[PDB]
Amino acid sequence: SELLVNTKSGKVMGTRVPVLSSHISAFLGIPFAEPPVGNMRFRRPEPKKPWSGVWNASTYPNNCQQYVDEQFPGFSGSEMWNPNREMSEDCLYLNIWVPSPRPKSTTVMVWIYGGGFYSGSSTLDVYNGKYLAYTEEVVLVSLSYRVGAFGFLALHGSQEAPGNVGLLDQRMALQWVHDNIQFFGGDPKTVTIFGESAGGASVGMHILSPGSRDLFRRAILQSGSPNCPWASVSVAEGRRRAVELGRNLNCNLNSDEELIHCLREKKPQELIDVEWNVLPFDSIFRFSFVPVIDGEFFPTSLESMLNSGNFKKTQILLGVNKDEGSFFLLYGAPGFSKDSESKISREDFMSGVKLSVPHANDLGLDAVTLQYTDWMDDNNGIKNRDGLDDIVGDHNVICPLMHFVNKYTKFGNGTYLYFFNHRASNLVWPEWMGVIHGYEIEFVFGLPLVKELNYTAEEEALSRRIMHYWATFAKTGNPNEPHSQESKWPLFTTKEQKFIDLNTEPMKVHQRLRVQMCVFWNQFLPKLLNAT
Amino acid sequence: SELLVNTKSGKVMGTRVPVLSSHISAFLGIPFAEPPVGNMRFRRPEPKKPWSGVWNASTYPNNCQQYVDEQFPGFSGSEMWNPNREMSEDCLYLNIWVPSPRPKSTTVMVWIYGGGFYSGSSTLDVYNGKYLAYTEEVVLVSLSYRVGAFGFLALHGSQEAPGNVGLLDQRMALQWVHDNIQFFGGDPKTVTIFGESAGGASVGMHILSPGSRDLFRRAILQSGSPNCPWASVSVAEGRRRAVELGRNLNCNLNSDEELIHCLREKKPQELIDVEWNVLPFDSIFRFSFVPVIDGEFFPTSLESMLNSGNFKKTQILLGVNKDEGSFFLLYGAPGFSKDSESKISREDFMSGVKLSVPHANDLGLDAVTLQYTDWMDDNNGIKNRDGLDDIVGDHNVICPLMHFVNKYTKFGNGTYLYFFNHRASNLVWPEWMGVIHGYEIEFVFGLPLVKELNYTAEEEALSRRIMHYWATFAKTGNPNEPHSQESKWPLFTTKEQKFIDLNTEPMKVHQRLRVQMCVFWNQFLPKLLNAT
Numbered sequence A, B: 001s002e003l004l005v006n007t008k009s010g011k012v013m014g015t016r017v018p019v020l021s022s023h024i025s026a027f028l029g030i031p032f033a034e035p036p037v038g039n040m041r042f043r044r045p046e047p048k049k050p051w052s053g054v055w056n057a058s059t060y061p062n063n064c065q066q067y068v069d070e071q072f073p074g075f076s077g078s079e080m081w082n083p084n085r086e087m088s089e090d091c092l093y094l095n096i097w098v099p100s101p102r103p104k105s106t107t108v109m110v111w112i113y114g115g116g117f118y119s120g121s122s123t124l125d126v127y128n129g130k131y132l133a134y135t136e137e138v139v140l141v142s143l144s145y146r147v148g149a150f151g152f153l154a155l156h157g158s159q160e161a162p163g164n165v166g167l168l169d170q171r172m173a174l175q176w177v178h179d180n181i182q183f184f185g186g187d188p189k190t191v192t193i194f195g196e197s198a199g200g201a202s203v204g205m206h207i208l209s210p211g212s213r214d215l216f217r218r219a220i221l222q223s224g225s226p227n228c229p230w231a232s233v234s235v236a237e238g239r240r241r242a243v244e245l246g247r248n249l250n251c252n253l254n255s256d257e258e259l260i261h262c263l264r265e266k267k268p269q270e271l272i273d274v275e276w277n278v279l280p281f282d283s284i285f286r287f288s289f290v291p292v293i294d295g296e297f298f299p300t301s302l303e304s305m306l307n308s309g310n311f312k313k314t315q316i317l318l319g320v321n322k323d324e325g326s327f328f329l330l331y332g333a334p335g336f337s338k339d340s341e342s343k344i345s346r347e348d349f350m351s352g353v354k355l356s357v358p359h360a361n362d363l364g365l366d367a368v369t370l371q372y373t374d375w376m377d378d379n380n381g382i383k384n385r386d387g388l389d390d391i392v393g394d395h396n397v398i399c400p401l402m403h404f405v406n407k408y409t410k411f412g413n414g415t416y417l418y419f420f421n422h423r424a425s426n427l428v429w430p431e432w433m434g435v436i437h438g439y440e441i442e443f444v445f446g447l448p449l450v451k452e453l454n455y456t457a458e459e460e461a462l463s464r465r466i467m468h469y470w471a472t473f474a475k476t477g478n479p480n481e482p483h484s485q486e487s488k489w490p491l492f493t494t495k496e497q498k499f500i501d502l503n504t505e506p507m508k509v510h511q512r513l514r515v516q517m518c519v520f521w522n523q524f525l526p527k528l529l530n531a532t
Ligand SMILES: C[N+](C)(C)CCCCCCCCCC[N+](C)(C)C
Pocket: A069, A078, A081, A276, A285, A327, A328, A331
């Protein structure tokens, strides 16, 4: 049977699913870890105990326990990112889409979802891998990992809650793929991991971490970077936050064992209820429980690893969207609302800056303001709004990624950089939000090939073009077809710094992605803050 | 006799001079002070002792002792600014051009030359007031003042060399005009003082100084401002420089009397030979002996006087040229030469910045570099050259003037601001220098009406238009004709900040003269340097 596959963990039974007037095989909800429940909450993941008989893999698994965005109840723009299955701590499962007939040894792509390390699901409509698997003839895997305190509570020194367990969940899924994907027709030595936002930072993190490097061949990072300022905290700061979480839940605080024991007695929703109360500052684009620079998973500071070339040397493909910031301003910054065009006064602009750069002393805030203010017309609400949008996107996504790109490319074996700047015609969010954080994913996963979802023909053409770049890159380390002629995506070098736009217009080539502003964020501002 | 005028100081005899196929009267070399020679070197000026008989005022006087630019021997571009008469310490004279027939009580304009407070002459071809006097029916006076150590050696506490004596020379000329100009047909209560660069700063300084305010009605400042960073030093710094001058000349240094006595025995050229050796830094646009913030001439810091409105409240007209910096880069900055287009490498750009902002710590230099560098194309020698040009012009001229303008306008009775951006067609300096420091003066003085000097018809039209603005403003406090219609020069307000271009093209109106960069120089950079 094509739907029956025998793995090292045991037999699994998939389901035949339809896709674009054809069919392929899907193996959903396959366990790769012991349910991290009870005394195992906050601990490292254990490998799943092998099972006898047949594991039913015909339906999606539960999603990991997490904060649920109810800011816009009944609004598909926001609700499409929420869990679409029951939440449970028993959530460590993966999903596999396999072409029909089953291939022998083909390219594997493993998706790692984002969601600020506080949310995310493998099971979203928009992450359904069937279109990519069918169209590009790849084995598409999506994994899950613990989020929030469950995945990232960090009390360094303890073995009961060491930190980074969410990242170890990802590694365990990758280990399981490396060990078993061959039985699904996948080629375990041609695995490309890829993810968006926190997923893209995670990808970067496995590139850095010695314990993960051998479990994949190459990587794609979308709108996310391991060095992002939101994506990791110090041991001291992880500790402070964990202790503060216990303080919110009336826990005994005079030792780790006491603290952790108390946190384990709590129901999951109690932890989620107070999760946001531990942030050190009034801020946007900052999440409570994130990876920790622990000296184990990351042997040293991210920056020194990058300078010394202490990382996996392979091919990467990465990029960003035009308007990464707009989501976080709508949710947090004063003046912004979903149903107005959110023209921002000078007052709200100043408030926005402070929220965007929470560490900054006054001089730093002045430096940012000066850099993003048109003083010929500083009461223009459109320019204030768009300028804040740029501040948030540059500081948190684009400029960290450009620093990663520039550092990686010195030691790596091939970089390809993109700038995605097409706003989907059927987007339900307002116009001011522009090309929004997260809305290249639907193009990457082929949703525009589905007519019912009401994309334009030009958007179908762009989605196919992107899927082919991603998959071809996964296969070969190069997004370009060996023989073809519709503009080659040129290699990114230190010297020339070429990248491409990804939109419906005929593809042009550019250089030095937001270099002016990123020199500000990567060179000047940190030196200003260091000297004051 | 029309050429014989009886003054409070005594009778003077002028000469009939030709101008544009007509004639007017000229009274050249009229003394207004005792020759400040011998024991009077460095002292305050004394009023000229009245004389009997007739003083011959038919030829220009001697020029004050000064450094002579021999950087381009035989080059008219530079030599037109050099002394054209014998140099002598006996140099305190003024010149008056009077319409024919002599008027009864008409508008007076008093010219104060520039030259970094280290050079200048009342007698240059380009400062000949006959064209302005004839064309606009004004009495045109040009005064002289001591420069260099002679005019500005400052040992605060001593009465033998208190500082600011060059400025007191200017005041004494103004006193003499206030007392005597009526006998030349001038109206002493409608006197407009005007000057360029150091002359324009001087104008500003008499506006500030209580002892000068009553001696004129209104003011015009061209490319110069009292608050310019080059135009004044502290008491401590004046003292240091004076002592260092004596150290260069082998003087006894253990007291002021000893020091001053020694400096007085020296021939004038000995002082000039070492004058440049006392600058505290490697720098451009900085001059050794300048006005001092002494608590007498300026009762407090310039900035506090400006904030508190401690200044003469009248009408002013002021402005700047597009490329104020280019002179000082040619003379001092590496990479720049007169006979090449002076494309500047990244190395020379960094060297240039440091010379332009000599106080700055490393972070300040970084801030300036970032502000004036196109990082999409940072090896472009044209942009590096032009960017340095802008740095020097903004820091030293435009942005100080805009700070003066904004402060003055809160308490004043009328401001009119111009941006002069026409490059004269017959300029002998290279193209890269643009619209050069000092080259609006020839338009202000009407030289383009002389056909032999080879200006275009369009340049004659511009010169007449400028002379009429200047003179009309001098008469009324408004450059605009009560009834006319060829675009009114609008008033500068705090709110709207309107100014006009001065060029051959049809006059358009703008706002917020270089606000982006001047916010950098006036608000941000000083706050950065203060906090580091
Ligand atoms: C402290 N609380 C409870 C108030 C606010 C937490 C919820 C705000 C989410 C912040 C991230 C903004 C982006 C959200 N998106 C992309 C997920 C919809």
